[PDB]
Amino acid sequence: PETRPFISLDLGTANVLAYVSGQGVVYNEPSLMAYNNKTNSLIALGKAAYDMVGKTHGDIRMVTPLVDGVIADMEAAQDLLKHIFSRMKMMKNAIVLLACPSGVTELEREALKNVAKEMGAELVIIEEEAKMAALGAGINIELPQGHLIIDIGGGTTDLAIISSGDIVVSRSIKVAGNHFDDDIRKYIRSEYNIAIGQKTAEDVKKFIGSLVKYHNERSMQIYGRDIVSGLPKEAKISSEEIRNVLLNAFSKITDLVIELLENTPPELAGDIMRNGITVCGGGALIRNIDKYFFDIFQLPTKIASDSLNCVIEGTKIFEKTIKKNIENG
Amino acid sequence: PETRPFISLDLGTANVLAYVSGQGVVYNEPSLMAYNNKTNSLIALGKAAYDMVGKTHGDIRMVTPLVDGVIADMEAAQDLLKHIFSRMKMMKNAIVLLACPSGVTELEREALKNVAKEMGAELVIIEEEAKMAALGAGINIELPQGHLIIDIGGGTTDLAIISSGDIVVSRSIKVAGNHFDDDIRKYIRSEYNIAIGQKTAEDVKKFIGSLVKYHNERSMQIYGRDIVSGLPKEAKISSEEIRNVLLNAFSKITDLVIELLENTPPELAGDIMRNGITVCGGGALIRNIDKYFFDIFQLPTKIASDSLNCVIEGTKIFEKTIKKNIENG
């Protein structure tokens, strides 16, 4: 029948999402998984392990199953989707739609399918994240109109020119959210001589981070370890200095856009001026990222609604398409 | 019986038309056909492929089945008329009237017949496009009065002196719509340093193109790729500069008219002054093309109604003639 079960997965570097047809997104948690480093046993995953990063003894190993679409830890990758498939095992012929970044090789994608199949998958389908992100952002990719999708995730900023449902031009760079957190951590050590964890650096980016000055920007207090005294030390950080370090981090992302537009066919480039840039992903939540991209490229920039879910929302829309590609052909 | 099915085809370089007796023109779409360059499979044809030219990855091959009446792609030519014959297969002894330009050799015309026969044609008839265009423009070619037919198509400008239903003098040159689009593209690159696709160049010719200044000519905005910055760039183009580049493109067409009239018998040349020039085809829609031809040759110039359909409308009229040539003789 056509009521066949359907599951799609966003195996992101920072957040893992799982959509089930008829039940919505049943799983949406960070990718961190805590393991007992003495017994190689699973301790926690999702939020329970994400609240412990930087707060664990050496006997607790923090693991990310997938980094930039590639299986970073085989034991963790299959432990993750076993937890997801078990909540589907307890409700038999589900369709497994995987979304893979453009940088994943075919050899690594066959590994993603087998790991899914090894844990109990019958039919595994792989689609490009860019067209999934474009579907979740509201673009009708079937139309012959060029669109520019910028997906700023946890460890990869993915760029793609999409027209007629295909990736005309594609670029990728390993500079994203995790790189922004490290630069914030390294800046606060060079400017205030205070060591902070990755979690504090990430919360600063979310609370006061921006690329253009916004209305009534506030300053927040950090709490870390003093390099000089060794004792815990406090510090006040303004939104401006967080903006200047994000400005510097976006330097390698901006030139990639120049390189993507350099090799874009002239008829597509015409559509980019009228259709514009669509920024999606976690990095799309940077304050005034639309005005920042507009001020540089003179291109109209819009932020997709629920940018975190553009990939998993696109797989929602693409379920009726793969069922056509399965029932037919 | 005399109610035998009848189909005629305009296999033009830019537009393909198909007339069925009793149903009118059932097919009228551009010639572009999109093929999967990895599997050599047909993806789209007509408008679906025409909206994608300049907007496709390298894995999509854009194909024109016939260029200037000659089979440019064997696989595409038979894929095209199979799509047309199928819509006739689903409604058995149809007459296939083909209209061929004057530049097609008899060896290439036998290929056009066999390809039609190979896909299921029983009786294939070939007629000259010039007399078909003259029939579709309102000329009674049976009368002993000379007429000058200028057919400006996609890739060929065809000239013919017609009298008593025969081609007295004939000339042809491979300078037409596609040459005009390229010159517009090359002018906008040399004047504004902006690369545009073929589709934008064609729309400029249709929206503001002309050969003589017309009432309240407007300027339009193009959108392409900047040669210098590599980013998409906008430009404003007036109707005057588009007129001057069309003026230069029509230089090789004007001297061909001089050459056609140079070798025209003196009694025919007398009729050309009184009957005049009949401009038909897509290029006949150039604004003030009648006044432009009149200012050069001092010959009265008239634009045929529905110049795009002069060939397919002429085959409509010539159905009762070929039935006479079939039932008799």
Add this chain to the structure above:
Amino acid sequence: PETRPFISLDLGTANVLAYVSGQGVVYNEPSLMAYNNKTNSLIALGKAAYDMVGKTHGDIRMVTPLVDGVIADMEAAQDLLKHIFSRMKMMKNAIVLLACPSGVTELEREALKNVAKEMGAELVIIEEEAKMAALGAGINIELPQGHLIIDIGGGTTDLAIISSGDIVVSRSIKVAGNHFDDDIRKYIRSEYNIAIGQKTAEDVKKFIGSLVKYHNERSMQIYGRDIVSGLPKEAKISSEEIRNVLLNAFSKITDLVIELLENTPPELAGDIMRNGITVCGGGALIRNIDKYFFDIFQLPTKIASDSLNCVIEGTKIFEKTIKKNIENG
């Protein structure tokens, strides 16, 4: 019986006429016959081919069956009278009266009879055109009174002194209508540097041609090919310059009249002063040709009524005479 069918023919260089007893002139059309030069097949004859002269491709051969009474084309001559005999075949013992110019040899006249007999003629009679033209002009040739008949046809100007029903003195020259058309064509090329066809040159002679200035002579517009530019060119031509070129063309006809009167017996020459000159044929329609001949020879000149039909009208009158020569003798 005496109700035997009777057909007479005027196989002129310019016009072919056919009279049937009891039905009048059933055929009266120009001599031009159009043939497919690739298949030697008959395409058209009469007016249909006359409207195409100078307006045909090289694959269409224009043929005149008889030039100056001699079979110019054997295939065309028998194709012509087969078309005439067929309209008599569909209504069985007809009398075939042929009128032959004085320049036709007996060997060529036997060819005219056999070609008629080869297509289905039983009894073929040949008579002199001059006495037939004299009968059609109203002269009672049986009377012993001398008359001067000037027959200006398409390619021959025939002169004869007729008395008692016999040709006393006869002269002929190959200068007539076709020579006048060529001189008009050659004059318009030398005076205006414009090439015109034979049809335009003939219509000028008919519309404004004359030998003496007439009342309210007009100027007409020609349309031909310019020698310099190669483009069609217009020109205005007055009746005076057309008169001066006809005056020069009639130079060789005038001296022939002097030569005919030089060898005319003195008793006949006396009758020429009182009876006068009778001008018949197409050339008799030249405006003021009677006053022109009168001003030169001081001889009274009269134009025969329906000068084009003087030969075929004379054969009408000579039917009762040949029936006497057949029933008796």
